[PDB]
Amino acid sequence: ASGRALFQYPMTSKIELNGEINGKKFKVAGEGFTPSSGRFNMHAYCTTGDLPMSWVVIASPLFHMFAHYPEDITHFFQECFPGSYTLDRTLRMEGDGTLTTHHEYSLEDGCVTSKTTLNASGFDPKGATMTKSFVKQLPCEVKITPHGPNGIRLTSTVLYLKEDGTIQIGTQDCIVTPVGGRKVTQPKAHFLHVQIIQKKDPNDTRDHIVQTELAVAGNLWHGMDELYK
Ligand SMILES: [Cl-]
Ligand SMILES: [Cl-]
Ligand SMILES: [Cl-]
């Protein structure tokens, strides 16, 4: 049993995230539900107190294996199982700060566990990230290309909406690397449409978020694959 045969829905998720931003250390944990292909939620909470940064900015750090892929595009993230993959992220909030994340995953009993670290240095203490002035991030297209002999790369430019109704940009670059000591067939260049919706639980006493991601793969530009050898 490998690849897509390991991703029979419903499934669950867990996260453990150890973070630091501008010297403030924090932890998040969460549990989530993946009812069906491409629709996955996460109820995360800061176990150290208040989260010292925007929940909107930490949204993308909070599971590409749950994306919905048509049959005719390789689902690289799923085809890495068994063996798994790492994700390395750089998220540059333009004019504000840069953060990196490192993720490791394991699959057991229908549950994907993410162990993630986040490092963030030199953010503007009056920027939207540290003052928590963001309302949401807008849906984007993530460009996925083959990267080196065995990886992929994911790039996106994300619009973050502040409370005054104006936009800040984040520039996001990820490398996925199989860690299963085996070759995984690389997909053709393609795009992922991604939307995040965040809300609060009526009762939870913790600093928390209830997040849903919709993530759908598509060959949005048939000619793009020609450019990536
Ligand atoms: Cl927030
Ligand atoms: Cl990404
Ligand atoms: Cl493909």
Instruction: Indicate the domain borders of the chain.
Output: 1-229
Of residues 92, 99, 26, 103, the one with CA closest to residue 62: 103
Of residues 91, 88, 17, 83, the one with CA closest to residue 52: 17
Experiment used for this model? X-ray
Based on the number of CB atoms within 10 Å of its own CB, is 66 exposed (0-12), middle (13-18) or buried (19 or more)?
buried
Tally Cβ neighbours within 10 Å of residue 148.
10
Residue type for position 106: S
Residue type for position 228: Y
Please tell me the distance between residue 225's alpha carbon and the centre of ligand 1 in angstroms.
38
DSSP type of residue 182:
S
- State the sign of the Cα–Cα–Cα–Cα dihedral 54, 58, 60, 66: negative
3 state DSSP class of 6: helix
Nearest ligand to the C-alpha atom of residue 129: 1
End-to-end CA distance of the chain: 30
Resolution (A): 2.1
Q: How many angstroms separate the CA atoms of 1 and 8, rounded?
A: 11
Tally Cβ neighbours within 10 Å of residue 20.
15
Residues with CB under 5 A from ligand 1 (ion): 54-55, 132
Please tell me the distance between residue 217's alpha carbon and the centre of ligand 3 in angstroms.
11
Based on the number of CB atoms within 10 Å of its own CB, is 68 exposed (0-12), middle (13-18) or buried (19 or more)?
middle
1-229: CATH number: 2.40.155.10
Please tell me the distance between residue 218's alpha carbon and the centre of ligand 3 in angstroms.
10
Residue located via tokens 């104006």: 166
Based on the number of CB atoms within 10 Å of its own CB, is 120 exposed (0-12), middle (13-18) or buried (19 or more)?
buried
